[PDB]
Amino acid sequence: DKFEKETRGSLFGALVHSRTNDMDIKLDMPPVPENADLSGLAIKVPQSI
Amino acid sequence: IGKSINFLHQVCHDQTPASKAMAVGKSAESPKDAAELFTDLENAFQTKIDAAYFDTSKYL
Amino acid sequence: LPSQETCLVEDLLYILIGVDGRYISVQPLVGRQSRSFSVEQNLDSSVKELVNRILPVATNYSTVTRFVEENSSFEYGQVNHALGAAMRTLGKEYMILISQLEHLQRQGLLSLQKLWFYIQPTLRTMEVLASIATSLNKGECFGGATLSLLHDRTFGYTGDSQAQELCLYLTKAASAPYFDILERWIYRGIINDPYSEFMVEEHWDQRYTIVQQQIPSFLQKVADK
Amino acid sequence: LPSQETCLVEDLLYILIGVDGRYISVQPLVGRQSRSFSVEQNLDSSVKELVNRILPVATNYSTVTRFVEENSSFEYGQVNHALGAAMRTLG
Amino acid sequence: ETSLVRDLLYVFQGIDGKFVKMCNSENCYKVDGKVAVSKSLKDITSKLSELGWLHNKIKKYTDQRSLDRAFGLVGQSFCAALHQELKEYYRLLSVLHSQLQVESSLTLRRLLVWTFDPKIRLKTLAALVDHCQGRKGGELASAVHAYTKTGDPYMRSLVQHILGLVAY
């Protein structure tokens, strides 16, 4: 059940923005950061806690 | 363990070895595997077959 | 004529993700490391040099992705397959600022010099992943000796914050397999993997075959232990 | 193209309880034991995915018809008439 | 452009769409006789090509069983797995139509990558079935376990769900 809820929520991993059981949510990436225009950017790095 | 249950069928009984606590176990197991994520047990599965093994061998 | 200047900007972003152009032609080479891309020449000598300046930056990514997304998938399942799948995971998050960049387009609002200034920190970031891809292909390292190069690398480099952060992260997710088979060997006493990763390779008082070619990534004193 | 798309949705809802559609022709083969459906010549080329809704309602009626035939006429109170009532509750 | 966006929904939903690909094998490549189009559409057709092909590989095994009582056991608990990860292949297909029909609405590089995480999930599931066409018990239980010996916990979990259900 944990696998199903997690999978169903993440829309097969195609949502990396939050988990929700919604099939009518628009898939949007966050707008360009504040300081991007100053610092450029580099790749984002995630964590485990 | 499957050979030994057949030797008390040459003694003829419908008894699950010794106690009826072996019988409760079948009922407990079927929900416990069903409720899980999709995962089967198998490091714990070999642990209660010891407790089944010593039971049906001394009893036979 | 000024439209051809934005058209070369949009064409570059497909080179950048490592696929075929719209007017920038792709050479075939096998074992390629830098395949030549022939640009559409432009009529003013200054906008064409700018696209040649960004051009190794798109090339060096596209190559080091193309073979680690497949070479890893061929592997037997050692720690380096866990490493090599983790580069593909990291290549997911690369594609988010590029997919957001084209989101800002529906007319020209970018230039070539803004493209390079946006990826300027990220070009040091991909090329320190290029040197991992290069060594592991030269040796064709087995799983004990990958981690032995890789250890020293995330602890012999400093040059960018977000770069050291990743090369720790992904070596720590390749060391985590290795550490777990250590715990199965130092607590239970079993040793099971497709291909052995340790010095010990079981079967007088001989019971082991020992080598110094697959020793732990850390100094040889812990390997004796 | 979207106008035909919402149409074949609508028309499917009428078909689904094992009843006559609008542009979907149903003909009983042997006494309502089998019924072949004939989808309209579509102006989109989702024709293969239309037939992947045909086979769900294909296997629909041949449950329903069989058991309304069992429990009303065969007169076996034991099981047949009783289970026909059960499957009617799942209907 | 946008016609191809409604077209790419249909080999995911089944097989074929707007312009026929003429094969349920090999790789499910665009056939439409349009080459005076740009070559980068062509590169997105070759991504799509192994998306639609990897979908039609999952249909073959559960439809070759065409539910039979002979090996009613273990063969069909694996098909129930194949049905549960199909349903989800359709579930990201539906948030992609909800983007299409709004009451960007056209694809980008976003979904171009998004699709490939299901490809590598469904590839894990292609690798479990190419190994064993057999329906015989304990032969499928030795088939899916040889993919749980491998490195990387990412697909290991995916094969644990199947090995837990093959075992059930």
From TrEMBL, chain A:
It is found in: Cytoplasm, Cytoskeleton, Microtubule organizing center, Centrosome. Component of the gamma-tubulin ring complex (gTuRC) which mediates microtubule nucleation. The gTuRC regulates the minus-end nucleation of alpha-beta tubulin heterodimers that grow into microtubule protafilaments, a critical step in centrosome duplication and spindle formation. Belongs to the TUBGCP family. Component of the gamma-tubulin ring complex (gTuRC) consisting of TUBGCP2, TUBGCP3, TUBGCP4, TUBGCP5 and TUBGCP6 and gamma-tubulin TUBG1 or TUBG2. TUBGCP2, TUBGCP3, TUBGCP4, TUBGCP5 and TUBGCP6 assemble in a 5:5:2:1:1 stoichiometry; each is associated with a gamma-tubulin, thereby arranging 14 gamma-tubulins in a helical manner. Gamma-tubulin at the first position is blocked by TUBGCP3 at the last position, allowing 13 protafilaments to grow into a microtubule. This is Gamma-tubulin complex component 6. It comes from Xenopus laevis (African clawed frog). The gene is tubgcp6.L.
Automatic annotation (TrEMBL), chain C:
Residues 9-225 form the Gamma tubulin complex component protein N-terminal domain. It is found in: Cytoplasm, Cytoskeleton, Microtubule organizing center, Centrosome. Component of the gamma-tubulin ring complex (gTuRC) consisting of TUBGCP2, TUBGCP3, TUBGCP4, TUBGCP5 and TUBGCP6 and gamma-tubulin TUBG1 or TUBG2. TUBGCP2, TUBGCP3, TUBGCP4, TUBGCP5 and TUBGCP6 assemble in a 5:5:2:1:1 stoichiometry; each is associated with a gamma-tubulin, thereby arranging 14 gamma-tubulins in a helical manner. Gamma-tubulin at the first position is blocked by TUBGCP3 at the last position, allowing 13 protafilaments to grow into a microtubule. Component of the gamma-tubulin ring complex (gTuRC) which mediates microtubule nucleation. The gTuRC regulates the minus-end nucleation of alpha-beta tubulin heterodimers that grow into microtubule protafilaments, a critical step in centrosome duplication and spindle formation. Plays a role in neuronal migration. Belongs to the TUBGCP family. This is Gamma-tubulin complex component. It comes from Xenopus laevis. The lineage of its organism: Eukaryota, Metazoa, Chordata, Craniata, Vertebrata. The gene is tubgcp2.L. The chain holds residues 209 to 448 of 896 of the full protein.
TrEMBL record, chain D:
It is found in: Cytoplasm, Cytoskeleton, Microtubule organizing center, Centrosome. Coiled coil: none annotated. Component of the gamma-tubulin ring complex (gTuRC) which mediates microtubule nucleation. The gTuRC regulates the minus-end nucleation of alpha-beta tubulin heterodimers that grow into microtubule protafilaments, a critical step in centrosome duplication and spindle formation. Plays a role in neuronal migration. Component of the gamma-tubulin ring complex (gTuRC) consisting of TUBGCP2, TUBGCP3, TUBGCP4, TUBGCP5 and TUBGCP6 and gamma-tubulin TUBG1 or TUBG2. TUBGCP2, TUBGCP3, TUBGCP4, TUBGCP5 and TUBGCP6 assemble in a 5:5:2:1:1 stoichiometry; each is associated with a gamma-tubulin, thereby arranging 14 gamma-tubulins in a helical manner. Gamma-tubulin at the first position is blocked by TUBGCP3 at the last position, allowing 13 protafilaments to grow into a microtubule. Belongs to the TUBGCP family. This is Gamma-tubulin complex component. The lineage of its organism: Eukaryota, Metazoa, Chordata, Craniata, Vertebrata. The gene is tubgcp2.L.
